[PDB]
C-alpha cells in the first residue's frame, strides 16, 4: 500500500497504551519498508520492518516477512546519553504459493492475530511457561 | 499454560469465520505442543505448534516459536479421495533475554497482534503489494 503513519491502539498488557510509527522509507538494496517510533533519537527507538518477495528461479512462492525490534534505555550515572541494555525481537514470515487465493491468505493473517490473544500464547510469551 | 481447545473467532477477510483447535499432546523429544483441527485424515488438518526453549550453554536467549500450517484440498479427474495441493505456512519467532521484565514481553505480543490488523499489513498479505 502506502507508507503512512501507523497508530497502534490498545497495545500493551493492560491495553491502554499507544505506539505511533512514522515511515522511514524503503531500502533500494533489499526492498524493505521501515518504520520507527514518533519522537526518539536514532538507534534508541522502536523499529518495524516489512518486505514482500516474488517468485524467482530460486523460490517458487511468495514470502511476506515482518520483523519488529524494540530496545531498553538505561540512563547510567555520569553520562548524558542513554545506552541500550537489551533488545527484544519478533520476526514473522509467511509463505504463500502462486495459486493461493485472497481468502486463504487472509485466513492465515487473521488466525495469527486471534491466536496471540489466547491463553495458550499469553502464558507462553509474557510468562515463558511451556504448554503442558 | 495447559492444552485445551483454543476456539478462535472473527477470522477471515470479512470477519465471520471461526476455527476450533483440538489438542494433540506435547512431543517430549523437542518440547513442541500441538493443536489440530477435527479432521479424520491427518493430511487435511489445520495444525498449530508452539514451543518455548530455555537458554542453553549456546543460545543464551529464550525463544518462543509458533508455527501455523493450512492445507487446501481438491480432487482431480479420475481420482476419488481429495489430495493436498497447497500449503500456506506461518512462522513467528520471539526472542528475549534473561533480564527482560514481563511488560516488555507483553508489549511485543500485543504490538504484533495490532500490526496484523492495520491497513499497511492487510494489503501486503491479502493483496501481495510491497509497501510503496
Amino acid at each position: 500500500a502506502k507508507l503512512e503513519t501507523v497508530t497502534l491502539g490498545n497495545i500493551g498488557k493492560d491495553g491502554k497504551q499507544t505506539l505511533v510509527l512514522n515511515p522511514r522509507g524503503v531500502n533500494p538494496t533489499n526492498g524493505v519498508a521501515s518504520l520507527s517510533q514518533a519522537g526518539a533519537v536514532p538507534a534508541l527507538e522502536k523499529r518495524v520492518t516489512v518486505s514482500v518477495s516474488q517468485p524467482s528461479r530460486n523460490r517458487k512462492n511468495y514470502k511476506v516477512q515482518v520483523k519488529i525490534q524494540n530496545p531498553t534505555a538505561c540512563t547510567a550515572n555520569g553520562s548524558c546519553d542513554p545506552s541500550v541494555t537489551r533488545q527484544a525481537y519478533a520476526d514473522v514470515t509467511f509463505s504463500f504459493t502462486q495459486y493461493s487465493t485472497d481468502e486463504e491468505r487472509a485466513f492465515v493473517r487473521t488466525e495469527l492475530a486471534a491466536l496471540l490473544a489466547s491463553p495458550l500464547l499469553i502464558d507462553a510469551i509474557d510468562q515463558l511457561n511451556p504448554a503442558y | 499454560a495447559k492444552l485445551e481447545t483454543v476456539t478462535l473467532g472473527n477470522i477471515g477477510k470479512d470477519g465471520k469465520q471461526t476455527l476450533v483447535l483440538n489438542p494433540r499432546g506435547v512431543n517430549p523429544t523437542n518440547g513442541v505442543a500441538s493443536l489440530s483441527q477435527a479432521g479424520a485424515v491427518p493430511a487435511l488438518e489445520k495444525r498449530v505448534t508452539v514451543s518455548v526453549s530455555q537458554p542453553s550453554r549456546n543460545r543464551k536467549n529464550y525463544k518462543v516459536q509458533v508455527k501455523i500450517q493450512n492445507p487446501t484440498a481438491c480432487t482431480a479427474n479420475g481420482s476419488c479421495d481429495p489430495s493436498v495441493t497447497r500449503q500456506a505456512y506461518a512462522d513467528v519467532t520471539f526472542s528475549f533475554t534473561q533480564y527482560s521484565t514481563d511488560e516488555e514481553r507483553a508489549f511485543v505480543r500485543t504490538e504484533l497482534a495490532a500490526l496484523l490488523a492495520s491497513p499497511l499489513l492487510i494489503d501486503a498479505i491479502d493483496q501481495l503489494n510491497p509497501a510503496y
Partner: nanobody
Amino acid sequence: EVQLVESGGGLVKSGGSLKLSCAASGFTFSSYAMSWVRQTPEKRLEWVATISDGGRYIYYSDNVEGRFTISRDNAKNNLYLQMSHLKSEDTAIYHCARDSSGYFPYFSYWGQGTLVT
C-alpha cells in the same frame, strides 16, 4: 488444582453496595479471562459479566450494566465485583467461573459462591 474461593455476601437491604472477591489459586490467573455467574433461588443460572485477560474488554448483561462494575488484580490474583442499587431481584449465589480458551466463554471451572440478598 484449579480452585476459586469466594468471599463477601450477607444480608444487605435494597439500595446498598457490596464487593465480592475470588481467591483463584492453582493456575496462572493473569492469562485467562474471568466471569461472574449467578444462580437465583428459583434454581436458574444467569450470566453477570466477563472481564478479559488484562482487564481491557468487558461484557455485561442487560440487568447488570447500569449499576455493577467488574475488575481484577493480576498481582494479588483477585477478581472483584462492585455492586450498587440492589434492586430486590439479585438474591443469588454468585459463582466465580474460569473462562475457556476462546472468543466467548463456556465456563470450564467453577466455585462455591456467596449468598447475597
